[PDB]
From a paper:
A prominent member of the PspA family is the vesicle-inducing protein in plastids 1 (Vipp1), also known as IM30 (inner membrane-associated protein of 30 kDa). Vipp1 binds to negatively charged membranes and membrane binding depends on stored curvature elastic stress.
Moreover, by replacing the hinge 2 region of Vipp1 with ten alanines, we generated plasticity-restrained Vipp1 assemblies. The resulting variant Vipp1 dL10Ala indeed showed reduced structural plasticity when reconstituted with membranes, as it mostly formed type II tubes (69%), including single rings (27%) and stacked rings (3%), and type I tubes (2%). However, the dL10Ala monomer models had an overall extended length and showed less flexibility in the hinge 2 region, especially in single-ring monomers, which also explains the observed larger diameters of dL10Ala rings, as smaller rings require stronger bended and less extended monomers. The type II tubes have one continuous approximately 170-Å-long α-helix formed by α2, α3 and α4 presumably stabilized by the introduced deca-alanine stretch. Our 3.0-Å Vipp1 tube structure now reveals that D5, R6, R9, R12 and E23 of α0 interact with three different subunits through α4 (R170), α4 (K174) and α1 (D35) to hold these helices in place, thereby aligning the interacting subunits and helices in an orientation favoring rings and type I and II tubes over the PspA-like assembly, in addition to described lipid interaction properties.
Residue numbers in the entry:
A (entry chain A): 112 to 167
B (entry chain A): 2 to 111
C (entry chain A): 2 to 56
The structure:
C-alpha cells in the first residue's frame, strides 16, 4: 500500500511530462512552419521587385 | 567547363534575338503589370503573418485561462484539506505560466 | 524564371492592345454597373449575418 501510493504518483508524474512534451511539440512545429513561410515570402518578393523594375 | 560556356553562348545568342524582337515600351508596361501582381503576392503572405501573430495570442489566452482553472482547483483542494492535490494543481499552473512567457516572447517578436 | 517574365510580356502586350480597343468612358460606366452588382453581392451576405445572429 505504501508502494502503490508511490506508483500512483509516478504514473501521474509520467503522464504530466508526456502531456507537457505534446503541448511543446505543437508550438515548436508551428514556429517551423511560420519560419519557412517568412523566409520564402520575404526573399521571393524582394528579389522579384528589384529584378523586374530594373530590367524594364 | 569550356563546352558549358560555349553552350550558353549559342543559347544566349538565340535568347538575345528574342529579347530584341519585343518592344521595350510594351515589355516595360508588362513589367509594371507583373510588378503589381508581385505586390499582390506580398500582401497575402504579410496578411497571413498577422493571422499567425493572432494565433500565438490565442494560444496565450488558452494557456492563461487554463492556469486560472488550475488555480481554482488548487483553491478547492486547500478548502478540502487535500494539500497534496493543491501541489499537483500548482505544478500544472507553473508549466502553463512558463509556456505563456514563451508565447509572450514569440508574440513580441511577431 | 526568365521565360516566365518574357512569357508574361508577350501575353501582356496583346492584353494591353485589347484594353486600348474599348472606350474608357463606356468601360467606366460598365465598371459602375459592375460595382452596383458588387453591392448586391454584399447585401445578401450581410443580411445572412443577421439571420445567423438571430439563429
Amino acid at each position: 500500500r505504501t508502494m502503490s501510493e508511490n506508483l500512483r504518483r509516478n504514473l501521474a508524474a509520467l503522464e504530466a511530462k508526456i502531456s507537457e512534451a505534446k503541448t511543446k511539440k505543437n508550438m515548436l512545429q508551428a514556429r517551423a512552419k511560420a519560419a519557412k513561410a517568412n523566409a520564402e515570402l520575404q526573399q521571393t518578393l524582394a528579389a522579384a521587385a528589384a529584378a523586374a523594375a530594373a530590367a524594364a | 567547363g569550356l563546352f558549358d560556356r560555349l553552350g550558353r553562348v549559342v543559347r544566349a545568342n538565340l535568347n538575345d534575338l528574342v529579347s530584341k524582337a519585343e518592344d521595350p515600351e510594351k515589355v516595360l508596361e508588362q513589367a509594371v503589370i507583373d510588378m503589381q501582381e508581385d505586390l499582390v503576392q506580398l500582401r497575402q503572405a504579410v496578411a497571413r503573418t498577422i493571422a499567425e501573430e493572432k494565433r500565438t495570442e490565442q494560444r496565450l489566452n488558452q494557456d492563461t485561462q487554463e492556469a486560472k482553472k488550475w488555480e481554482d482547483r488548487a483553491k478547492l483542494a486547500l478548502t478540502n484539506g487535500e494539500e497534496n492535490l493543491a501541489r499537483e494543481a500548482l505544478a500544472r499552473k507553473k508549466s502553463l505560466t512558463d509556456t505563456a512567457a514563451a508565447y509572450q516572447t514569440q508574440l513580441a517578436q511577431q
